[PDB]
DNA sequence: GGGTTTCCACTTATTCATCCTTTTAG
DNA sequence: CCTAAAAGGATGAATAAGTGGAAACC
């Protein structure tokens, strides 16, 4: 079952990653051997996504990552041409576009067989230093000798894939002063590191609702785009993901979510039996699925 | 066959997703 | 008084990113 190209690119902005290995290999003619690719690592439950992606691109290999994870690794050099073609027609918009750029650059040096010369390896070290977490220091100990991205969401099918990765569909039960002492608050969320604060704010306007609650943890910091007004969730957010279908386990979470939303539309969230069903759906979704 | 590629097992730091309470708006 | 909306506290882990080893090619 193939994945829509834009949805895939959305799920890549969220879950994907590029890799450029520059390993010390004594059996190599320049002392170093390289490996270039693109990978996604999900929980074992979303293995069906990696397989669907594999059927869509016709490339990559799947192996386990520990007991609870599985990966899709596309390293076969000729298969890297599929990655580039796709991402050229359906580009990324996260700061990962800066990583994809460096990916193409490393691709060129190897397509010219330049990674087999002392300069090519030196050129790859230059490419890797600004890629993801940069060189491993020791590579700088052996080779001592940014540019932010700011695009906007291209369309909803992208948000679908991205929300399929970073998204959260929360039924928030609040201890309130109402008759039942429990207020039902549906919450839609998208979490992202503060490196893309622009894009996150872009969500407010692009969807016509929501806000950003600053998030932080000791040394780290990120953002959380949330939507709490039921009218926006019932009228603006739910329809977006009804036409632009989600993928993975998070779809079932989204469906259960809407079930509660129908009950909130019918005012059954105020009755006792309603609060039972809602509390029922909640316990069976997300980490309780 | 000697240099290179591709693969499969495996590791880890944090950025996520997840759950919750309190406070404010209407 | 009642319900909805927004703000914020807390954290384990599924991601992002990476590594060790060597069979598989060419
Ligand atoms: Ca991400
Ligand atoms: Ca995810
Ligand atoms: Ca998570």
Short mmCIF file of C-alpha atoms (C1' of nucleotides) and ligand atoms in Angstrom, two decimals:
data_model
loop_
_atom_site.label_atom_id
_atom_site.label_comp_id
_atom_site.label_asym_id
_atom_site.label_seq_id
_atom_site.Cartn_x
_atom_site.Cartn_y
_atom_site.Cartn_z
CA UNK A 1 0.00 0.00 0.00
CA UNK A 2 1.72 3.14 -1.28
CA UNK A 3 1.93 6.45 0.59
CA UNK A 4 1.01 9.78 -0.95
CA UNK A 5 4.26 11.61 -1.83
CA UNK A 6 3.40 14.75 0.13
CA UNK A 7 2.32 12.76 3.19
CA UNK A 8 5.61 10.86 2.98
CA UNK A 9 7.59 14.12 2.85
CA UNK A 10 5.65 15.30 5.89
CA UNK A 11 6.44 12.13 7.79
CA UNK A 12 10.07 12.59 6.72
CA UNK A 13 10.32 16.12 8.13
CA UNK A 14 9.19 14.61 11.45
CA UNK A 15 10.74 11.13 11.63
CA UNK A 16 13.33 10.94 8.84
CA UNK A 17 17.07 11.44 9.01
CA UNK A 18 20.10 11.64 6.74
CA UNK A 19 23.40 9.89 7.39
CA UNK A 20 26.95 10.37 6.12
CA UNK A 21 29.41 7.82 7.49
CA UNK A 22 33.13 8.56 7.10
CA UNK A 23 34.78 5.53 8.69
CA UNK A 24 38.46 4.73 9.18
CA UNK A 25 39.14 1.62 7.08
CA UNK A 26 42.73 0.36 6.81
CA UNK A 27 41.69 -1.80 3.84
CA UNK A 28 40.58 1.39 2.05
CA UNK A 29 42.77 3.14 -0.50
CA UNK A 30 42.38 6.58 1.13
CA UNK A 31 42.21 5.12 4.65
CA UNK A 32 38.50 6.00 4.90
CA UNK A 33 35.34 4.45 3.46
CA UNK A 34 32.01 6.28 3.25
CA UNK A 35 28.33 5.42 3.44
CA UNK A 36 25.47 7.75 2.53
CA UNK A 37 21.80 7.17 3.11
CA UNK A 38 18.50 8.14 4.69
CA UNK A 39 16.75 6.30 7.52
CA UNK A 40 13.59 6.26 9.63
CA UNK A 41 13.34 4.51 13.01
CA UNK A 42 9.91 3.93 14.57
CA UNK A 43 8.49 1.76 17.33
CA UNK A 44 7.83 -1.82 16.27
CA UNK A 45 4.08 -1.13 16.08
CA UNK A 46 4.58 1.28 13.15
CA UNK A 47 6.60 -1.22 11.12
CA UNK A 48 3.73 -1.27 8.61
CA UNK A 49 4.65 2.35 7.79
CA UNK A 50 8.25 1.49 6.93
CA UNK A 51 7.01 -1.36 4.73
CA UNK A 52 4.49 0.90 2.98
CA UNK A 53 7.27 3.43 2.42
CA UNK A 54 9.48 0.66 1.05
CA UNK A 55 6.74 -0.39 -1.38
CA UNK A 56 6.36 3.25 -2.46
CA UNK A 57 10.02 4.03 -3.17
CA UNK A 58 10.97 0.42 -4.04
CA UNK A 59 14.23 0.99 -2.11
CA UNK A 60 15.74 0.52 1.33
CA UNK A 61 16.19 -2.38 3.74
CA UNK A 62 14.42 -3.00 7.05
CA UNK A 63 16.12 -4.27 10.20
CA UNK A 64 15.32 -4.17 13.90
CA UNK A 65 16.72 -1.55 16.28
CA UNK A 66 16.71 -3.19 19.68
CA UNK A 67 13.72 -5.21 20.85
CA UNK A 68 11.22 -2.33 20.54
CA UNK A 69 12.22 -0.54 17.33
CA UNK A 70 12.67 -1.13 13.62
CA UNK A 71 14.45 0.90 10.95
CA UNK A 72 14.22 1.57 7.23
CA UNK A 73 17.75 2.19 5.92
CA UNK A 74 18.35 3.32 2.33
CA UNK A 75 22.12 3.11 1.78
CA UNK A 76 22.51 1.42 -1.63
CA UNK A 77 24.07 4.31 -3.52
CA UNK A 78 22.08 3.93 -6.74
CA UNK A 79 18.90 3.82 -4.63
CA UNK A 80 19.85 7.23 -3.23
CA UNK A 81 18.70 8.65 -6.58
CA UNK A 82 15.09 7.82 -5.68
CA UNK A 83 15.42 9.78 -2.42
CA UNK A 84 16.78 12.81 -4.27
CA UNK A 85 14.17 12.79 -7.04
CA UNK A 86 11.31 12.52 -4.53
CA UNK A 87 12.69 15.25 -2.25
CA UNK A 88 13.33 17.49 -5.26
CA UNK A 89 9.67 17.37 -6.32
CA UNK A 90 8.26 17.32 -2.74
CA UNK A 91 10.90 19.22 -0.74
CA UNK A 92 11.18 19.38 3.02
CA UNK A 93 10.36 22.48 5.06
CA UNK A 94 11.79 21.66 8.49
CA UNK A 95 15.35 22.61 9.31
CA UNK A 96 16.04 19.11 7.97
CA UNK A 97 16.03 20.64 4.48
CA UNK A 98 19.46 21.94 5.45
CA UNK A 99 20.44 18.35 6.15
CA UNK A 100 18.99 17.11 2.86
CA UNK A 101 21.01 19.79 1.05
CA UNK A 102 24.25 18.53 2.59
CA UNK A 103 23.07 15.04 1.65
CA UNK A 104 22.92 15.95 -2.04
CA UNK A 105 26.38 17.55 -1.79
CA UNK A 106 27.89 14.38 -0.34
CA UNK A 107 26.03 12.49 -3.07
CA UNK A 108 27.80 14.48 -5.81
CA UNK A 109 31.33 13.83 -4.54
CA UNK A 110 30.60 10.10 -4.47
CA UNK A 111 28.87 10.01 -7.86
CA UNK A 112 32.14 11.34 -9.31
CA UNK A 113 34.06 8.65 -7.37
CA UNK A 114 35.75 11.56 -5.55
CA UNK A 115 35.37 9.83 -2.16
CA UNK A 116 38.24 7.59 -3.32
CA UNK A 117 40.72 10.52 -3.28
CA UNK A 118 42.26 12.43 -0.38
CA UNK A 119 40.37 15.58 -1.41
CA UNK A 120 36.99 13.87 -1.71
CA UNK A 121 37.26 12.60 1.86
CA UNK A 122 38.34 16.08 2.93
CA UNK A 123 35.33 17.50 1.08
CA UNK A 124 33.05 14.99 2.83
CA UNK A 125 34.42 16.01 6.23
CA UNK A 126 33.46 19.57 5.32
CA UNK A 127 29.97 18.35 4.40
CA UNK A 128 29.56 16.31 7.59
CA UNK A 129 30.73 18.95 10.07
CA UNK A 130 27.57 21.00 9.35
CA UNK A 131 25.34 17.89 9.02
CA UNK A 132 23.15 16.88 11.98
CA UNK A 133 25.50 16.76 15.01
CA UNK A 134 28.63 17.46 12.94
CA UNK A 135 31.96 15.67 12.95
CA UNK A 136 32.86 13.37 15.83
CA UNK A 137 35.66 15.64 17.11
CA UNK A 138 38.17 12.84 16.50
CA UNK A 139 37.45 13.38 12.80
CA UNK A 140 38.43 16.97 13.57
CA UNK A 141 41.43 15.56 15.46
CA UNK A 142 42.28 13.90 12.12
CA UNK A 143 41.00 16.73 9.87
CA UNK A 144 41.54 19.96 11.86
CA UNK A 145 42.15 21.96 8.66
CA UNK A 146 24.43 26.67 9.48
CA UNK A 147 22.12 28.63 7.15
CA UNK A 148 18.59 28.43 8.53
CA UNK A 149 15.56 27.26 6.54
CA UNK A 150 12.30 29.22 6.50
CA UNK A 151 9.59 27.70 4.32
CA UNK A 152 5.88 27.36 4.99
CA UNK A 153 3.58 24.34 4.86
CA UNK A 154 3.00 23.46 1.18
CA UNK A 155 -0.39 21.83 1.76
CA UNK A 156 -2.48 19.68 4.11
CA UNK A 157 -1.18 16.35 2.79
CA UNK A 158 2.17 17.46 4.18
CA UNK A 159 0.64 18.35 7.55
CA UNK A 160 -0.94 14.88 7.54
CA UNK A 161 2.41 13.11 7.32
CA UNK A 162 4.05 15.55 9.73
CA UNK A 163 1.16 15.30 12.21
CA UNK A 164 1.35 11.52 11.78
CA UNK A 165 4.78 11.78 13.41
CA UNK A 166 4.78 14.71 15.82
CA UNK A 167 1.02 14.76 16.39
CA UNK A 168 -0.89 14.11 19.59
CA UNK A 169 -4.65 13.62 20.03
CA UNK A 170 -5.40 14.14 23.72
CA UNK A 171 -8.67 13.75 25.60
CA UNK A 172 -8.00 15.96 28.61
CA UNK A 173 -10.11 15.21 31.69
CA UNK A 174 -10.02 18.20 34.06
CA UNK A 175 -11.14 18.34 37.69
CA UNK A 176 -13.57 21.26 37.48
CA UNK A 177 -16.38 22.81 39.53
CA UNK A 178 -19.04 21.60 37.08
CA UNK A 179 -21.73 19.20 38.31
CA UNK A 180 -19.61 16.16 37.39
CA UNK A 181 -16.37 17.81 38.56
CA UNK A 182 -14.71 16.56 35.35
CA UNK A 183 -14.54 18.82 32.28
CA UNK A 184 -13.89 17.11 28.93
CA UNK A 185 -11.38 19.06 26.80
CA UNK A 186 -10.24 17.69 23.46
CA UNK A 187 -6.69 18.84 22.69
CA UNK A 188 -4.86 18.68 19.37
CA UNK A 189 -1.10 19.09 19.59
CA UNK A 190 2.04 19.23 17.47
CA UNK A 191 5.43 19.25 19.21
CA UNK A 192 8.65 20.52 17.65
CA UNK A 193 12.04 21.84 18.76
CA UNK A 194 12.34 25.62 18.91
CA UNK A 195 14.69 25.52 15.90
CA UNK A 196 11.53 25.75 13.76
CA UNK A 197 9.55 28.29 15.79
CA UNK A 198 8.66 30.02 12.52
CA UNK A 199 7.02 26.96 10.97
CA UNK A 200 5.14 26.30 14.22
CA UNK A 201 3.71 29.82 14.22
CA UNK A 202 2.97 29.16 10.56
CA UNK A 203 0.52 26.53 11.82
CA UNK A 204 -1.63 29.13 13.61
CA UNK A 205 -2.34 31.05 10.41
CA UNK A 206 -2.31 28.08 8.03
CA UNK A 207 -5.05 26.33 10.01
CA UNK A 208 -6.81 29.42 11.37
CA UNK A 209 -6.70 28.50 15.06
CA UNK A 210 -4.54 27.24 17.91
CA UNK A 211 -1.59 28.78 19.73
CA UNK A 212 1.90 27.87 20.93
CA UNK A 213 2.63 26.95 24.56
CA UNK A 214 6.34 27.30 25.27
CA UNK A 215 7.84 24.00 26.41
CA UNK A 216 11.15 23.41 28.19
CA UNK A 217 12.94 20.77 30.26
CA UNK A 218 15.99 21.72 32.34
CA UNK A 219 18.51 22.47 29.59
CA UNK A 220 16.37 21.75 26.52
CA UNK A 221 13.48 23.67 24.98
CA UNK A 222 10.79 23.03 22.39
CA UNK A 223 7.34 24.27 21.35
CA UNK A 224 3.85 22.81 21.48
CA UNK A 225 1.17 23.96 19.03
CA UNK A 226 -2.23 23.29 20.61
CA UNK A 227 -5.90 23.72 19.74
CA UNK A 228 -8.46 23.61 22.56
CA UNK A 229 -11.57 25.46 21.33
CA UNK A 230 -13.93 22.61 20.45
CA UNK A 231 -15.40 24.63 17.57
CA UNK A 232 -11.98 24.87 15.91
CA UNK A 233 -11.31 21.19 16.59
CA UNK A 234 -14.73 20.06 15.34
CA UNK A 235 -14.87 22.50 12.40
CA UNK A 236 -11.26 23.16 11.32
CA UNK A 237 -8.93 20.42 12.57
CA UNK A 238 -11.04 17.25 12.29
CA UNK A 239 -11.95 17.96 8.62
CA UNK A 240 -8.29 18.48 7.65
CA UNK A 241 -7.43 14.94 8.77
CA UNK A 242 -10.63 13.46 7.36
CA UNK A 243 -9.71 14.46 3.80
CA UNK A 244 -5.95 14.05 4.38
CA UNK A 245 -5.79 10.62 5.98
CA UNK A 246 -3.18 9.94 8.66
CA UNK A 247 -0.89 6.91 8.73
CA UNK A 248 0.34 4.52 11.39
CA UNK A 249 -1.06 3.73 14.80
CA UNK A 250 -1.77 7.42 15.39
CA UNK A 251 -4.72 7.12 12.98
CA UNK A 252 -6.62 4.89 15.41
CA UNK A 253 -5.86 7.43 18.12
CA UNK A 254 -7.29 10.12 15.83
CA UNK A 255 -10.42 8.05 15.15
CA UNK A 256 -11.13 7.45 18.84
CA UNK A 257 -10.50 11.18 19.25
CA UNK A 258 -13.27 12.03 16.79
CA UNK A 259 -15.63 9.60 18.54
CA UNK A 260 -15.32 11.72 21.68
CA UNK A 261 -15.79 14.80 19.50
CA UNK A 262 -19.11 13.51 18.17
CA UNK A 263 -20.24 12.94 21.76
CA UNK A 264 -19.14 16.47 22.68
CA UNK A 265 -21.08 17.80 19.68
CA UNK A 266 -24.21 15.98 20.91
CA UNK A 267 -23.66 17.25 24.49
CA UNK A 268 -23.36 13.68 25.83
CA UNK A 269 -20.08 14.65 27.53
CA UNK A 270 -22.25 16.15 30.29
CA UNK A 271 -24.30 13.03 31.01
CA UNK A 272 -22.91 10.27 33.21
CA UNK A 273 -22.97 7.56 30.54
CA UNK A 274 -21.17 9.97 28.22
CA UNK A 275 -18.37 10.60 30.70
CA UNK A 276 -18.12 6.80 31.03
CA UNK A 277 -17.71 6.23 27.29
CA UNK A 278 -15.25 9.12 26.94
CA UNK A 279 -13.21 7.81 29.87
CA UNK A 280 -13.53 4.43 28.13
CA UNK A 281 -12.10 5.59 24.80
CA UNK A 282 -9.32 7.52 26.55
CA UNK A 283 -7.94 4.53 28.47
CA UNK A 284 -7.87 2.48 25.23
CA UNK A 285 -6.00 5.02 23.06
CA UNK A 286 -2.44 6.39 23.04
CA UNK A 287 -0.16 4.53 25.48
CA UNK A 288 -3.14 2.41 26.57
CA UNK A 289 -3.88 0.99 23.13
"C1'" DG B 1 41.39 -10.56 -5.67
"C1'" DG B 2 41.95 -6.16 -3.32
"C1'" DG B 3 39.33 -2.23 -2.64
"C1'" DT B 4 34.55 -1.04 -2.13
"C1'" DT B 5 29.89 -1.40 -1.23
"C1'" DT B 6 25.80 -2.96 1.09
"C1'" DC B 7 24.01 -5.00 4.81
"C1'" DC B 8 22.57 -6.48 9.54
"C1'" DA B 9 23.13 -6.20 14.62
"C1'" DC B 10 23.44 -2.75 17.71
"C1'" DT B 11 23.83 1.96 20.70
"C1'" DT B 12 22.28 6.43 22.82
"C1'" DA B 13 20.94 11.32 23.84
"C1'" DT B 14 16.84 14.20 23.53
"C1'" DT B 15 13.16 15.64 21.39
"C1'" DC B 16 9.43 14.55 21.30
"C1'" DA B 17 4.39 12.78 22.41
"C1'" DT B 18 2.07 11.86 26.58
"C1'" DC B 19 -0.55 12.74 30.80
"C1'" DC B 20 -1.87 15.80 34.31
"C1'" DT B 21 -3.26 20.10 37.41
"C1'" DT B 22 -4.22 24.96 37.89
"C1'" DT B 23 -5.88 29.23 36.12
"C1'" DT B 24 -8.54 32.03 33.36
"C1'" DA B 25 -12.30 33.31 30.09
"C1'" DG B 26 -17.21 33.74 29.04
"C1'" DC C 1 -22.91 29.01 39.69
"C1'" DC C 2 -21.53 26.50 35.35
"C1'" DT C 3 -18.82 25.20 31.44
"C1'" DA C 4 -15.23 26.21 28.18
"C1'" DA C 5 -10.76 27.84 27.09
"C1'" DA C 6 -5.97 28.52 27.94
"C1'" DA C 7 -1.75 28.02 30.70
"C1'" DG C 8 1.52 25.24 32.72
"C1'" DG C 9 3.91 21.33 35.34
"C1'" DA C 10 6.23 16.65 34.63
"C1'" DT C 11 8.75 12.81 32.25
"C1'" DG C 12 9.58 8.29 30.08
"C1'" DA C 13 10.82 6.95 25.63
"C1'" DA C 14 10.18 6.61 20.52
"C1'" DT C 15 12.40 8.58 17.94
"C1'" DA C 16 16.83 11.07 15.27
"C1'" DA C 17 21.34 10.12 14.87
"C1'" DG C 18 24.92 7.07 14.97
"C1'" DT C 19 28.26 2.67 15.44
"C1'" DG C 20 30.61 -2.22 15.05
"C1'" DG C 21 31.08 -5.93 12.30
"C1'" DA C 22 31.71 -8.26 8.21
"C1'" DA C 23 29.46 -10.63 4.02
"C1'" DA C 24 28.90 -9.20 -0.65
"C1'" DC C 25 30.29 -7.21 -4.78
"C1'" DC C 26 33.08 -5.59 -8.55
CA1 LIG D 1 11.19 15.64 14.65
CA1 LIG D 2 5.99 9.77 16.10
CA1 LIG D 3 7.62 10.44 22.32
#
